[PDB]
RNA sequence: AAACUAUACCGACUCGGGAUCGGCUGGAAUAAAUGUCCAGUCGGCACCGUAUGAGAAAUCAAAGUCUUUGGGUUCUGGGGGAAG
């Protein structure tokens, strides 16, 4: 049952828009990957972890993937599971031999 | 939750039914041998449960409605045999009068004498309920002497 | 003692998007807790949402993401005239821009613009932002 | 074979047929004797189910009345395994089941009793369509859209039986009661308390 | 199950790496595959694998080695990531004793600003997740059974109890990211012996 | 990785019968043979009171808090 | 009566951990039982951690799910004395 989980990512963000259609939000905040909260100026904990990519040589590529996290769920120990999790819709873990 | 217990008197006793509502596969007992049954019970006296309880144990049978499509006392209402004061307020008056019993020799004993009250009370506001709903007589009463010739 | 079934359901699912959860077993449900459900999934709110049949009430999983600010019922369901909605909508929501105050109709359930569109009112049910 | 229908006037080449087989069995088997005795039918469909396994099968919905219904329920494995048989299709069983309206209430002294229920009468349906097993399971599920989704769960031992007629009885179950079904397979999980 | 997989969990099951201590922490629940008849709690080894390689996916991501740090209390690793550190090119917390404000303060003496940090014990060096915690800094953590995933981002289930376990854990780890980072071969052996990461008495 | 919806068998089994999704009770019924006569009868898992063989009124249960007692070298099965 | 948890009753929902009293369900050991141990679970009295929940704080797993203010219901207070 993934469906709003998905649907949810599907169209991309956006700050206040007038009807002249400018943007009016001063900066977009990062929203956390799990919980999907907003990541503050002020977060102390909140977190943006990268993860390497690698090529069948065991060769990084120079990509990324960058999985934030915010306070609430870090300091909860819900990390090392939503982390997992977020790797694996992403097709990224468990790592494949 | 258990009735005029306040603070503390709540759980859970069992009783949980299948999802299963066919009457189970193993079971050969026709619907109509199973109303015989259940009527010879009856008119030995038993109780709509009691009759429950006995199908149950020795003969195999797990719910009767889901085997017949009548309950027990619908049954026992279509095929005669009827209790005629409901078995529930039956045994509700049968210990507020083994209270009655036990509190006229001991006289000072309060916890029986609350226990009591207790009862009584439950039993006014079960009469209402079968009152209403047309299943007792409409002046009939519960006091001490009236109910206690009452077939309790 | 159990009274408004829209609120026990309500309620327990606000406290699991609060924390962070990612489903709710919700039980008992009614037609209205099922109504209000496919309005606030309609409108953005929760996602899917499936429904168990125990041969007895319900019970219904919520698949939530995060969305919901809150989401409750007013008791006792007040009776909104037209005219009464400006109070509604100013008193119980987070601003102009959003939120909806759901009410039943003569016509059936509605988020209160829904209400305007149709013209009707007159008995509210809970709201979710 | 007008015997075997409550309207004896007129019948379909289907019903024709249906009849004319409920006669030659109720001649061939002595199992069925009493079976075929009671039971009488108000209708027959056909459907036509087509799939993209380019497989046309027929399949044939016969409408027993309702005073046969308990006699058909026990006759139900016996009764599809010879009728499938005697024709080329596969076949199926319901009661013949009234509706009763909602907001038209014809007599101020009946209430409509809950048995015939747009619902439960269509519910029921679905029992009948899977006749010779039973639910094991039963869930609805809410699409985002706001379509309405029902998934069945079912009995594995019943696999053998079960498994073609799937598609026929989604077909049917369309087309009747408008409704999406979907199935699966579990095993019947009893939870004993076994002392080894 | 490759030879090269199968080397990796046999070198793991010898350094008795999926012995754990009896307490479960509940947010453990996941990493554990059995509990003993003598109350030894034992790790799923895949899982630890699997950690491993994420981990080293994490330390190959930082642009500059010197911007990941291992913080070690124990004595038992100090060695081991001591030497970690030395073939990963990145920072050693080598006094056992870890100060207070070392992350929080930038007046401090041992103060650093890692991008990633990596722990042996989350019960041991607690301190430092914690100031991990004012800071964004994301954690690796070597965990055993008893400890807490508070403020952790990628936990690897180990032993942190023993040299054998924690020592060929940071190796493997070493040699892993060796790989990623195009300094060593897939399919080539290393010629460092585990044997260096042990704590010498 | 826990789904409310495909909860895990050897969990519900752990569960109080109340707290199951399909909230689906402990008891079984069994054929029990008498030690002595070889008589098959059925008996509630947990039965109450007392059950006799009726053909030769022997002892084959004895009732307790859930548990029946099958006294001595009756056999049983579960029926399902 | 300081008749005191100075803490209304019925009902949901929100953390973790051992232990305890009463039922039950499996399992194990023995010297084979109204006794041990182990694992479940229902209900009690509590405790220990912990809250990115609450509070003026002391503190509180409720004293939480309250300006993001409405599950049901009785009761009580509105500066201090005068004054029960
Ligand atoms: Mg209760
Ligand atoms: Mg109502
Ligand atoms: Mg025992
Ligand atoms: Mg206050
Ligand atoms: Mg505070
Ligand atoms: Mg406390
Ligand atoms: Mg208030
Ligand atoms: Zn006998």
Same mark, same amino acid.
Request: glycine share 4%; net charge positive.
């Given at each position: 049952?993934?469906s709003?989980?998905?649907?949810?990512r599907?169209?991309?963000?956006?700050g206040?828009?007038?009807?002249?259609?400018?943007?009016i939000? &001063?900066?977009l905040?990062?929203?956390?990957?799990?919980?999907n909260k907003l990541?503050?100026?002020?977060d102390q904990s909140?977190?943006?972890?990268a993860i390497?990519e690698?090529?069948?040589?065991?060769?990084?590529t120079g990509?990324?993937?960058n999985?934030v996290?915010?306070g609430s769920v870090?300091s909860?120990?819900?990390?090392?599971? &939503?982390?997992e999790?977020?790797l694996?819709?992403?097709?990224?873990?468990?790592?494949?031999? | 939750?258990?009735?005029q217990?306040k603070?503390?008197?709540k759980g859970?006793?069992?009783?949980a039914?299948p999802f299963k509502?066919?009457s189970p596969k193993?079971l050969?007992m026709?619907?109509?041998?199973?109303?015989?049954?259940?009527?010879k019970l009856a008119?030995?006296?038993?109780?709509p449960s009691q009759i429950?309880?006995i199908?149950?144990d020795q003969?195999?049978?797990p719910?009767?409605?889901?085997?017949?499509?009548?309950?027990i006392?619908?049954?026992?209402?279509?095929?005669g045999?009827a209790?005629?004061?409901?078995e529930?307020?039956?045994?509700?008056?049968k210990?507020?009068?083994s209270?009655?019993?036990?509190?006229?020799?001991?006289?000072?004993?309060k916890?029986?004498?609350?226990?009591?009250i207790?009862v009584?009370?439950?039993?006014?506001?079960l009469?209402?309920?079968?009152?209403l709903?047309?299943?007792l007589?409409?002046?009939?009463?519960?006091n001490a002497?009236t109910?206690?010739?009452?077939?309790? | 003692?159990k009274?408004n079934?829209?609120?026990?359901?309500?309620?327990?699912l606000?406290?699991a998007?609060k924390?962070?959860?990612?489903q709710?077993?919700?039980?008992?449900?009614?037609?209205?807790?099922?109504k209000?459900l496919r309005?606030?999934?309609?409108?953005?709110?929760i996602g899917?949402?499936?429904?168990?049949?125990?041969?007895?009430?319900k019970?219904?999983?919520?698949?939530?993401?995060?969305?919901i600010?809150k989401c409750?019922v007013?008791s006792?369901r007040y009776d909104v005239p037209l005219?009464?909605?400006?109070?509604?909508?100013?008193?119980i929501?987070?601003?102009?821009?959003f939120?909806?105050?759901v009410?039943?109709?003569?016509?059936?359930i509605?988020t209160?613009?829904?209400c305007?569109?149709?013209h009707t009112?007159?008995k509210?049910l809970?709201?979710?932002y | 074979?007008l015997?075997?229908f409550?309207k004896?006037?007129?019948?379909t080449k289907?019903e024709?047929q249906?009849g004319?087989?409920?006669?030659?069995?109720?001649?061939?088997?002595?199992?069925l004797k009493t079976?075929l005795e009671?039971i009488?039918?108000?209708?027959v469909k056909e %459907?036509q189910?087509?799939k993209?396994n380019?497989?046309?099968?027929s399949?044939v919905?016969?409408?027993?009345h309702?005073q046969?219904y308990?006699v058909?329920?026990?006759?139900?494995?016996?009764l599809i395994?010879?009728?499938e048989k005697?024709l =080329?299709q596969?076949? %199926?069983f319901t009661?013949?089941?009234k509706?009763? *309206?909602k907001?038209?209430?014809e007599?101020?002294?009946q209430?409509?009793?809950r048995?015939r229920?747009?619902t439960?009468?269509?519910?029921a349906?679905?029992?009948?369509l899977?006749?010779? *097993?039973?639910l094991?399971?039963?869930?609805?599920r809410?699409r985002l859209?706001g379509?309405?989704?029902?998934?069945?769960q079912?009995?594995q031992?019943?696999?053998?039986?079960?498994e073609?007629?799937?598609d026929?009885?989604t077909?049917?179950? =369309?087309?009747?009661t408008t409704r999406?079904?979907?199935?699966?397979?579990?095993?019947?999980?009893?939870?004993?308390?076994?002392?080894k | 199950?490759?030879?090269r997989?199968?080397d990796?969990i046999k070198?793991?099951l010898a350094?008795?790496?999926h012995?754990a201590?009896i307490?479960?922490?509940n947010?453990?629940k996941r990493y554990?595959?059995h509990?003993?008849?003598?109350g030894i709690?034992?790790?799923?080894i895949?899982?630890?694998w699997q950690?491993?390689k994420?981990?080293?996916?994490?330390?190959?991501?930082?642009?500059?080695?010197?911007d990941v740090?291992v913080?070690?209390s124990?004595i038992?690793?100090?060695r081991?990531?001591?030497?970690?550190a030395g !073939?990963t090119?990145?920072?050693s917390?080598?006094?056992?004793r $870890?100060?207070?404000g070392?992350?929080?303060?930038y007046?401090?003496?041992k !103060?650093?600003?890692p991008?990633?940090?990596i722990?042996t014990?989350?019960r041991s060096?607690?301190?430092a997740?914690?100031?991990?915690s !004012?800071?964004?800094?994301?954690?690796?953590?070597l965990?055993?059974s008893?400890?807490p995933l508070?403020?952790?981002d990628?936990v690897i289930?180990?032993?942190?109890?023993?040299?054998?376990?924690?020592s060929?854990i !940071? $190796?493997?780890?070493?040699?892993?990211?060796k790989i990623?980072?195009?300094?060593?071969?897939?399919?080539?052996?290393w010629?460092?012996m585990?044997?260096?990461?042990?704590?010498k008495? | 990785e826990r789904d409310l919806?495909?909860?895990?068998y050897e969990?519900?089994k752990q569960?109080?019968?109340?707290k199951?999704?399909?909230?689906?009770?402990?008891?079984?019924?069994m054929?029990?043979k008498?030690?002595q006569?070889?008589?098959?009868?059925?008996?509630?898992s947990?039965?109450?009171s007392?059950?006799?063989?009726?053909?030769?009124?022997?002892?084959?249960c004895?009732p307790?808090?859930?548990?029946?007692?099958?006294?001595?070298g009756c056999?049983?099965?579960?029926?399902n």
């Amino acid at each position: 049952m993934n469906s709003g989980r998905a649907n949810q990512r599907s169209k991309p963000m956006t700050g206040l828009i007038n009807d002249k259609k400018e943007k009016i939000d &001063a900066y977009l905040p990062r929203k956390c990957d799990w919980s999907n909260k907003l990541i503050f100026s002020n977060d102390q904990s909140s977190v943006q972890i990268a993860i390497a990519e690698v090529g069948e040589n065991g060769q990084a590529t120079g990509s990324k993937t960058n999985v934030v996290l915010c306070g609430s769920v870090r300091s909860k120990g819900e990390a090392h599971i &939503a982390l997992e999790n977020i790797l694996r819709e992403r097709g990224l873990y468990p790592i494949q031999e | 939750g258990r009735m005029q217990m306040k603070g503390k008197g709540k759980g859970i006793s069992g009783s949980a039914l299948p999802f299963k509502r066919r009457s189970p596969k193993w079971l050969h007992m026709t619907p109509s041998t199973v109303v015989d049954l259940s009527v010879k019970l009856a008119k030995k006296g038993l109780t709509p449960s009691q009759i429950g309880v006995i199908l149950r144990d020795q003969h195999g049978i797990p719910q009767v409605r889901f085997l017949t499509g009548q309950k027990i006392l619908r049954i026992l209402k279509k095929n005669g045999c009827a209790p005629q004061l409901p078995e529930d307020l039956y045994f509700l008056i049968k210990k507020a009068l083994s209270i009655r019993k036990h509190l006229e020799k001991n006289r000072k004993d309060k916890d029986s004498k609350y226990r009591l009250i207790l009862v009584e009370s439950r039993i006014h506001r079960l009469s209402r309920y079968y009152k209403l709903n047309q299943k007792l007589p409409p002046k009939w009463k519960y006091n001490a002497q009236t109910a206690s010739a009452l077939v309790q | 003692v159990k009274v408004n079934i829209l609120a026990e359901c309500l309620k327990d699912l606000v406290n699991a998007e609060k924390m962070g959860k990612k489903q709710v077993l919700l039980r008992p449900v009614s037609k209205v807790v099922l109504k209000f459900l496919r309005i606030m999934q309609k409108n953005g709110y929760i996602g899917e949402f499936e429904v168990i049949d125990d041969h007895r009430s319900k019970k219904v999983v919520v698949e939530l993401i995060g969305r919901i600010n809150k989401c409750g019922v007013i008791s006792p369901r007040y009776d909104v005239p037209l005219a009464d909605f400006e109070k509604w909508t100013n008193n119980i929501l987070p601003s102009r821009q959003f939120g909806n105050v759901v009410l039943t109709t003569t016509y059936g359930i509605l988020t209160h613009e829904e209400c305007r569109k149709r013209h009707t009112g007159g008995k509210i049910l809970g709201f979710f932002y | 074979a007008l015997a075997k229908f409550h309207k004896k006037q007129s019948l379909t080449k289907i019903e024709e047929q249906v009849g004319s087989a409920l006669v030659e069995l109720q001649n061939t088997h002595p199992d069925l004797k009493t079976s075929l005795e009671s039971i009488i039918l108000t209708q027959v469909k056909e %459907f036509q189910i087509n799939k993209t396994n380019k497989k046309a099968k027929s399949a044939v919905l016969i409408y027993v009345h309702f005073q046969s219904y308990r006699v058909l329920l026990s006759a139900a494995r016996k009764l599809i395994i010879e009728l499938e048989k005697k024709l =080329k299709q596969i076949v %199926f069983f319901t009661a013949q089941r009234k509706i009763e *309206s909602k907001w038209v209430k014809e007599h101020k002294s009946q209430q409509r009793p809950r048995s015939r229920c747009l619902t439960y009468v269509y519910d029921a349906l679905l029992d009948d369509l899977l006749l010779p *097993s039973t639910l094991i399971g039963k869930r609805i599920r809410a699409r985002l859209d706001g379509t309405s989704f029902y998934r069945i769960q079912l009995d594995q031992n019943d696999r053998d039986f079960l498994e073609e007629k799937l598609d026929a009885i989604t077909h049917i179950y =369309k087309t009747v009661t408008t409704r999406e079904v979907t199935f699966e397979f579990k095993e019947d999980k009893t939870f004993h308390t076994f002392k080894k | 199950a490759t030879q090269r997989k199968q080397d990796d969990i046999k070198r793991l099951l010898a350094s008795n790496c999926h012995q754990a201590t009896i307490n479960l922490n509940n947010q453990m629940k996941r990493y554990i595959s059995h509990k003993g008849v003598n109350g030894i709690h034992y790790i799923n080894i895949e899982e630890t694998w699997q950690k491993i390689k994420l981990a080293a996916r994490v330390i190959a991501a930082v642009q500059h080695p010197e911007d990941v740090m291992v913080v070690c209390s124990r004595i038992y690793g100090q060695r081991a990531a001591i030497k970690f550190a030395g !073939y990963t090119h990145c920072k050693s917390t080598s006094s056992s004793r $870890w100060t207070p404000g070392t992350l929080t303060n930038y007046q401090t003496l041992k !103060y650093e600003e890692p991008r990633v940090l990596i722990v042996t014990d989350p019960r041991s060096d607690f301190q430092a997740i914690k100031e991990a915690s !004012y800071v964004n800094i994301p954690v690796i953590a070597l965990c055993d059974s008893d400890s807490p995933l508070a403020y952790v981002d990628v936990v690897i289930p180990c032993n942190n109890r023993s040299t054998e376990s924690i020592s060929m854990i !940071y $190796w493997m780890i070493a040699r892993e990211v060796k790989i990623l980072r195009g300094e060593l071969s897939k399919d080539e052996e290393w010629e460092v012996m585990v044997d260096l990461f042990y704590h010498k008495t | 990785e826990r789904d409310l919806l495909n909860p895990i068998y050897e969990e519900e089994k752990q569960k109080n019968k109340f707290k199951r999704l399909i909230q689906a009770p402990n008891s079984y019924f069994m054929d029990v043979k008498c030690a002595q006569c070889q008589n098959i009868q059925m008996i509630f898992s947990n039965a109450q009171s007392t059950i006799i063989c009726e053909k030769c009124s022997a002892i084959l249960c004895k009732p307790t808090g859930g548990k029946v007692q099958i006294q001595a070298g009756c056999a049983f099965k579960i029926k399902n």
